[PDB]
Structure formats: C-alpha cells, structure tokens
Amino acid sequence: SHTVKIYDTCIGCTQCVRACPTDVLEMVPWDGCKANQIASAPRTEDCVGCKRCESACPTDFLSVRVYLGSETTRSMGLAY
Amino acid sequence: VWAFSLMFLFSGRGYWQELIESIVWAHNKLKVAPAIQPRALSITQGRAVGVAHYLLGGIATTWSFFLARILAVG
Amino acid sequence: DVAGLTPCSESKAFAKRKKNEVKALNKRLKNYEADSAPALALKATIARTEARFDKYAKQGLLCGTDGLPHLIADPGLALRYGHAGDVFIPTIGFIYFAGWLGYAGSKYLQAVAATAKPIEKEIIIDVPLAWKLLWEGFGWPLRAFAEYKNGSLMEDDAKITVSPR
Amino acid sequence: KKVKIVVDRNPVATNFEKWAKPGHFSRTLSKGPTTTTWIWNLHADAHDFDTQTSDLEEISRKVFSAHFGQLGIIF
Amino acid sequence: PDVGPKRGTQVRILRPESYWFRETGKVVSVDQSGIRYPVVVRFEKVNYAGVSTNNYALDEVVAA
Amino acid sequence: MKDFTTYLSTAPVLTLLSVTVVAGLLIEINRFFPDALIAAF
Amino acid sequence: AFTPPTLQSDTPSPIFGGSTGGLLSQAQVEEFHVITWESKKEQIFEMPTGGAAIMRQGPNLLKLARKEQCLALLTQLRTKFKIDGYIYRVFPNGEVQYLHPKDGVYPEKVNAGRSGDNTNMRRIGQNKEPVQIKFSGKIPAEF
Numbered sequence: 186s187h188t189v190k191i192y193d194t195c196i197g198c199t200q201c202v203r204a205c206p207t208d209v210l211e212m213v214p215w216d217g218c219k220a221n222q223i224a225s226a227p228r229t230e231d232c233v234g235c236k237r238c239e240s241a242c243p244t245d246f247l248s249v250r251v252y253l254g255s256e257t258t259r260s261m262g263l264a265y
Numbered sequence: 266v267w268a269f270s271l272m273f274l275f276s277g278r279g280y281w282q283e284l285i286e287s288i289v290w291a292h293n294k295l296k297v298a299p300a301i302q303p304r305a306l307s308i309t310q311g312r313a314v315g316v317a318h319y320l321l322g323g324i325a326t327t328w329s330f331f332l333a334r335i336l337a338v339g
Numbered sequence: 340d341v342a343g344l345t346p347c348s349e350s351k352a353f354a355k356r357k358k359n360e361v362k363a364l365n366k367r368l369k370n371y372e373a374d375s376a377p378a379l380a381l382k383a384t385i386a387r388t389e390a391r392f393d394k395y396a397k398q399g400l401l402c403g404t405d406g407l408p409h410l411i412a413d414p415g416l417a418l419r420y421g422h423a424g425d426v427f428i429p430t431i432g433f434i435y436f437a438g439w440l441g442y443a444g445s446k447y448l449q450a451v452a453a454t455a456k457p458i459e460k461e462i463i464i465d466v467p468l469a470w471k472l473l474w475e476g477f478g479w480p481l482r483a484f485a486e487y488k489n490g491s492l493m494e495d496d497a498k499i500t501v502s503p504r
Numbered sequence: 505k506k507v508k509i510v511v512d513r514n515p516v517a518t519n520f521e522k523w524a525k526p527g528h529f530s531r532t533l534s535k536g537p538t539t540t541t542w543i544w545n546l547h548a549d550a551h552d553f554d555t556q557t558s559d560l561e562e563i564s565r566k567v568f569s570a571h572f573g574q575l576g577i578i579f
Numbered sequence: 580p581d582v583g584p585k586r587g588t589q590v591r592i593l594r595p596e597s598y599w600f601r602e603t604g605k606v607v608s609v610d611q612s613g614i615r616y617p618v619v620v621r622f623e624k625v626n627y628a629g630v631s632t633n634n635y636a637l638d639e640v641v642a643a
Numbered sequence: 644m645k646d647f648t649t650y651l652s653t654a655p656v657l658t659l660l661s662v663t664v665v666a667g668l669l670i671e672i673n674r675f676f677p678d679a680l681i682a683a684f
Numbered sequence: 685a686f687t688p689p690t691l692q693s694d695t696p697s698p699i700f701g702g703s704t705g706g707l708l709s710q711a712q713v714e715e716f717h718v719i720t721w722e723s724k725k726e727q728i729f730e731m732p733t734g735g736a737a738i739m740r741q742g743p744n745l746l747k748l749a750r751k752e753q754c755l756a757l758l759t760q761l762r763t764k765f766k767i768d769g770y771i772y773r774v775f776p777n778g779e780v781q782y783l784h785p786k787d788g789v790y791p792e793k794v795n796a797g798r799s800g801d802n803t804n805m806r807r808i809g810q811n812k813e814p815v816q817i818k819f820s821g822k823i824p825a826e827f
C-alpha cells in the first residue's frame with residue numbers, strides 16, 4: 186500500500202517497469218514524449234517499497250516516485 | 266581509532282552527501298571546486314571503513330596493553 | 340610578568356625541573372662505560388636537554404606556578420611585553436604558508452579546469468604545471484588582494500547552484 | 505590425459521603504458537574518474553580477477569604471478 | 580522555422596529542481612514535434628545518478 | 644620513459660613522494676634546529 | 685479482446701526433492717500463488733526457495749507463497765530459458781485470480797488499452813504544501 190506516482194517528465198524508457206520485481210509499473214500509450222509511451226502504476230497494491238523502480242529512472246529529477254505508507258502483509262513482504 | 270570507527274558505523278551516506286554539498290558550495294563560491302566530484306563513500310565502503318577502523322583500534326589497544334604489561338612485569 | 344607569570348629565567352620551579360630531568364638522565368648514565376655507544380647517546384641526550392633549558396630561559400618565556408613555559412595569544416598584550424614570538428609571529432608564518440599552499444592548489448584547479456579532460460588532470464597531475472604554480476604561489480597575499488580588489492576572486496551566487504530551499 | 509607442462513610464449517608485453525593509465529583492467533572503471541567513487545573502486549577491484557576477465561586461464565595465470573609477488577614480499 | 584535554442588550553443592539551466600540549476604550546458608538537439616521538454620542539454624559534470632544529459636523545456640533554458 | 648614518467652605523475656605516487664619530501668624536510672629542520680617553541684628571530 | 689487462461693489444476697509439477705522453504709501456515713489462511721509454464725526439454729532450474737528442481741517436458745505447475753517469488757522464478761525462466769509462464773493467485777476458498785501477464789502482453793511493452801492509474805500530470809515539486817493540506821488524511825502527492 187505504498188503510493189507510487191509517475192510524473193510527466195517521464196520519457197518512456199521502460200527501465201522502471203523492467204526493474205520492478207512485483208509487477209506494479211506498466212507501459213501505457215502516451216503522447217507527451219518521443220517514445221509515445223508513459224509508465225503507470227495500476228497494481229500499486231503489490232508495491233513492496235524496494236525503490237528499484239526509482240533507482241533506474243534516468244530523468245532528473247526522478248519521474249517514478251514512491252511514497253512508503255501503510256503496511257500490510259503484501260507490503261511488508263511476509264512469507265511466514 | 267576505535268572511537269573514530271563509530272563515525273562510520275552509526276552514520277549513513279545521505280547526511281554526508283548533503284554536508285559535502287554545502288562544502289562544495291563553499292568551494293564553488295571561490296572558484297576552487299574540483300573537476301572530480303567529491304562523493305560521499307558508498308554504503309558498502311562506509312561499512313568497510315567502519316569495520317576496518319573498529320578492528321584496528323581494538324587490536325592495537327589490546328596489543329599495546331599486553332606488551333606494556335608483559336614488558337614491565339614478568 | 341604579564342599575568343602573574345614570572346620569567347622562567349627567574350622561576351625556581353623551572354630550574355628545579357631542569358635539575359630533576361638532568362639528574363634522571365645522569366642516573367641512567369651510571370650503568371655504562373662512558374665511551375660506549377649507549378653512553379655517548381646518553382651524553383648527547385643530556386647535552387640536548389641542557390641546551391633546551393638554557394635556550395628557553397634566554398628567550399624569556401613565562402613560567403607559571405609550575406615550571407612550564409606559557410604563551411600569550413593577544414596582540415598588544417604581547418607586543419608591549421616582548422612576547423610576540425609566542426603566537427602572533429607564528430600566526431603570520433602559518434597564515435602565509437597555508438595561504439601559499441591553498442593558492443597554489445586553487446590556481447592549479449583553475450588552470451586545469453579549462454582543458455580537454457579536467458577530470459583526468461586531477462588523478463594524473465601535470466608536474467611541471469603544478470611546480471610552476473607552486474612557485475607562483477609565494478606572492479599569494481599580493482595576488483589574492485589584487486583579485487579581491489578586482490572582484491575576480493569570488494563568484495556571484497546567481498551562478499552557484501543551490502538546493503531547493 | 506597425461507599430466508604435462510604447457511606454456512604460452514610471451515603472452516604479455518612488458519611495457520609501462522598501462523601504469524600511466526589507472527583502471528585499465530576493468531571496463532567500467534575505464535573512461536576517466538567522473539567522481540571520487542572511481543578512485544575508491546579502482547582499489548576495491550584491483551585483485552578481483554574474476555571481474556577483469558571471464559577466462560579461467562587468465563584468472564589462473566594472474567593468481568600464479570600474484571603468489572610469486574607475495575612470496576617475494578615475504579622474502 | 581526552427582524553435583528554441585540553436586544546436587551547439589551554451590545555455591543556463593533554470594529548473595530549480597535540477598542538479599544543474601544555474602549551470603551551463605550545450606544543446607545537442609531540440610525536438611520540433613511538440614514535446615513538453617524537447618531541449619536536450621549535455622553537461623560535462625555528472626549528477627548523483629551518473630548521467631550528464633537532460634531534457635528541458637524552452638522557458639527554463641536561457642541561452643548564453 | 645614517457646609512460647614511466649606519466650606513472651610517476653600519478654596521484655598515488657606523486658602524493659606519497661611529496662609527503663616523503665615534506666616529512667624529510669621537517670625531520671631535517673628539527674634535526675638541525677630542535678626544540679624550537681617560539682619564533683625567536 | 686483478451687481472455688486470461690484457465691488454471692488447470694491437474695498439471696505435472698517439477699521433480700523436486702522437498703524443501704524447508706516451501707509453503708507455511710500463511711498459505712492456508714490468506715492466499716498463495718501458482719506459476720505454470722511449458723518446457724521444451726526436461727532441464728534443471730533453481731527454485732527460489734533454495735535447492736534445484738527439474739522441470740519436465742510440457743506443462744509444469746509450481747505453487748509458492750509470495751507473488752514476488754513467482755515473478756523471480758519467471759524472470760529466471762525468461763532470461764536463461766526463454767520460457768513464458770502464467771501466474772495465478774489462489775485463495776483458500778477456491779477463488780482464483782490471474783496475475784502477471786495481465787493483458788497477455790508483458791509489462792514493458794505498450795498494449796494500447798491499459799489503464800493509466802496513478803499518473804499525475806505535474807512535476808515533482810508541483811505538489812501541494814503540507815501546511816495547506818494539514819489535518820487531511822492524505823499526503824501531498826495524492827492531491
């Protein structure tokens with residue numbers, strides 16, 4: 186239950202969506218960049234908070250931005 | 266040295282990066298900034314420096330204590 | 340005397356300390372033939388100690404209640420009492436040498452910044468250039484005051500990057 | 505089959521060109537020190553012969569010669 | 580006609596949240612399509628992520 | 644040679660050389676002018 | 685349109701000798717995950733819970749606890765084997781979801797027909813100030 190947002194500085198490089206290990210980020214058609222694609226975070230219920238997505242964004246400042254918040258079993262990464 | 270090691274073992278890289286940012290502003294104001302970026306030590310290197318200093322300080326303390334004790338008595 | 344401190348050449352505790360330290364070294368001497376390498380080393384040490392204690396008494400350093408030289412860190416209260424060699428003169432000497440090294444480094448940075456690979460000329464120093472600038476750094480008071488009166492020493496903050504408040 | 509002696513003649517040329525350029529062994533370390541982290545990783549990866557080459561032959565040769573250097577230091 | 584700064588000129592960054600705020604960089608291209616940020620700027624100095632190329636708009640890329 | 648002198652200009656060697664030179668100089672100064680507590684001119 | 689496939693429960697499992705990292709009590713009260721793939725040869729792979737298993741010819745099924753373990757296994761398959769798999773979420777009442785290849789197309793490729801959830805059209809500092817949103821049960825980055 187972390188709040189993942191994607192801002193318009195995105196250039197659609199697909200790095201953030203290959204980085205994510207839990208499939209929270211996705212590519213959708215867009216038009217505000219040359220690649221004509223932007224990222225989106227529909228499955229944000231699955232966000233663990235690893236910030237691998239945020240560590241792969243080349244834009245300055247970062248386009249994918251994670252805000253850790255409420256903790257659930259999915260967010261806390263509990264196998265037991 | 267041992268106590269110095271604690272600097273590296275309790276702190277984190279972010280504090281040091283922003284402190285170095287202020288230092289670099291001070292240098293920029295006088296045209297003496299390096300072309301090679303001062304970057305705070307990586308997290309792994311911070312931990313490595315901390316453990317190296319901890320072990321150095323502890324072992325040197327015990328070594329000196331042992332040697333002085335055994336060379337003054339015995 | 341500047342603050343209840345009699346000149347070490349007068350203080351009895353200073354001479355007493357001289358006496359005791361020399362007597363310790365004499366006791367260390369009384370174990371070797373006065374012609375062996377240890378004996379020569381001890382004799383040289385005693386000569387060095389006596390020279391130091393006479394030199395300190397000659398220069399008029401101030402001794403306290405104990406027999407230890409004290410220093411004065413106020414210009415004016417050290418210049419009207421003949422004690423400017425304690426902090427003020429070494430202050431000038433340091434400030435000069437520190438400024439020399441700092442100005443040499445600063446000018447080397449500003450000289451290698453305007454080159455092809457400035458990040459390369461910091462890990463592989465250009466020794467002739469470094470040595471030339473190290474020699475030019477000796478006039479640093481003159482050149483630094485020139486650059487301050489010129490305004491070229493510093494950079495206006497409108498061009499230095501800052502954090503988002 | 506059959507244990508024997510096998511050597512390559514003159515695999516490496518004894519020059520000083522690579523001492524003039526630090527970081528030659530590692531591809532990532534190459535292309536200048538943009539930040540001091542380059543200075544630190546230059547030493548942190550000096551003997552990590554695994555990341556300088558994938559050929560086990562070259563790794564083994566480097567290990568052999570490094571052992572000779574260690575023996576020289578001990579002597 | 581061509582829009583924005585010329586290719587190869589030096590510009591001063593004016594985005595307050597950028598690493599190179601108030602620092603100069605050379606233009607390597609300006610896209611003409613209609614992107615929000617078409618100006619592509621190259622700096623000598625890298626940022627914390629190790630990159631040196633960034634895209635800026637046109638109101639926040641004062642030339643010279 | 645040129646590359647050897649380039650190696651001798653590297654930060655690891657030149658820094659160590661300069662520290663050795665300055666250390667030697669301070670050691671020599673203290674060997675000839677020892678125990679100097681003030682700037683007696 | 686796209687139709688997610690149906691979870692066939694009678695599927696052979698990889699040859700595995702038993703592990704101490706398998707399911708726990710959380711798979712009987714909350715939920716667990718199932719991954720299915722199709723192997724072109726019987727080959728040894730690394731199960732994310734420690735140890736090595738052998739995947740068999742044809743369809744293979746393997747059930748894990750966390751989704752992220754399933755995606756790690758799938759990334760291993762995609763890189764070192766070029767095998768494409770499907771991840772279902774099984775609840776203990778019987779309900780089954782279909783998870784990772786949501787639209788049949790992988791998350792890195794644009795599908796045209798996806799929902800742009802959580803996509804602000806402002807930059808990063810164009811958010812509101814915390815003093816303005818004080819006593820609101822939210823954070824500045826969701827206004």
Ligand code: CLA
Binds near residue numbers: 473
């Ligand atoms: C010639 C290079 C140079 C110059 C001109 C300066 C100048 C300055 N530094 Mg700085 N600094 C330097 C190198 C330099 N620094 C290096 C290499 C480091 C890493 C250890 C630092 C770390 C540093 C810190 C943490 C701080 C400063 C600060 C300051 C300012 C206060 C003055 C001071 O006492 O600093 C102190 C000087 C030191 C702590 C170390 C000096 C390093 C050596 C002695 C000088 C290097 C000379 C160079 C290697 C030789 C090149 C010669 C050439 C021929 C090749 C001042 C404008 C302070 C500030 O914020 O400003 C108010 C501050 O806090 N510096």
Ligand code: CLA
Binds near residue numbers: 550657
């Ligand atoms: C027992 C310790 C030991 C041993 C056996 C080695 C062995 C080796 N190192 Mg190594 N290294 C060591 C410690 C050691 N290192 C330490 C403590 C560091 C700390 C950072 C490094 C950092 C390091 C780096 C960065 C690199 C190596 C590299 C190498 C390989 C190339 C050696 C070579 O060809 O030079 C030949 C050796 C000789 C000709 C014998 C003399 C040694 C040198 C030349 C002395 C020159 C100094 C000279 C007297 C001037 C300085 C004195 C003056 C300043 C006063 C080699 C197998 C290089 C490599 O190939 O990476 C794989 C490489 O790039 N080392």
Ligand SMILES: CCCCCCCCCCCCCCCC(=O)OC[C@H](COP(=O)(O)OC[C@@H](O)CO)OC(=O)CCCCCCCCCCCCCCC
Binds near residue numbers: 313547
């Ligand atoms: C009493 C003795 C005290 C020693 C205690 C030892 C504990 C430290 C063990 C940590 C492992 C370090 C090795 C791996 C290193 C490691 O992985 O550490 C981590 C750190 C950097 O690693 P990173 O995670 O950043 O790696 C990323 C890079 O590989 C990618 O480019 O390395 C360092 O600490 C800096 C090395 C500088 C040290 C060289 C500076 C000068 C010293 C020269 C040699 C001194 C003389 C030697 C004696 C003759």
Ligand SMILES: CC1=C(/C=C/C(C)=C/C=CC(\C)=C/C=C/C=C(C)/C=C/C=C(C)/C=C/C2=C(C)CCCC2(C)C)C(C)(C)CCC1
Binds near residue numbers: 295412413414426445
């Ligand atoms: C006399 C004396 C003293 C002092 C006093 C006082 C009170 C002082 C002060 C002062 C002050 C109140 C100051 C201020 C200032 C300001 C500024 C502003 C500064 C500066 C600097 C700079 C700017 C530098 C630069 C440079 C150079 C020149 C060289 C190298 C490079 C560089 C760039 C670093 C005492 C008694 C202690 C002791 C005795 C002596």
Ligand SMILES: CC1=C(C/C=C(\C)CCC[C@H](C)CCC[C@H](C)CCCC(C)C)C(=O)c2ccccc2C1=O
Binds near residue numbers: 305
């Ligand atoms: C002080 C500190 C720094 C700042 C440290 C820096 C910038 C390194 C300082 C090295 C200076 C530039 C050289 C000092 C030279 C010494 C006299 C000897 C160095 C020994 C060498 C052989 C390495 C960090 O970057 C850091 C990172 C992560 C956790 C803790 C910390 C931390 O505590």
Ligand code: SF4
Binds near residue numbers: 194199242243
């Ligand atoms: S990594 Fe950043 S720029 Fe690239 S697609 Fe993701 S959000 Fe956009």
Ligand code: SF4
Binds near residue numbers: 231234
């Ligand atoms: S923080 Fe991790 S899990 Fe969450 S969206 Fe980013 S990469 Fe995915």
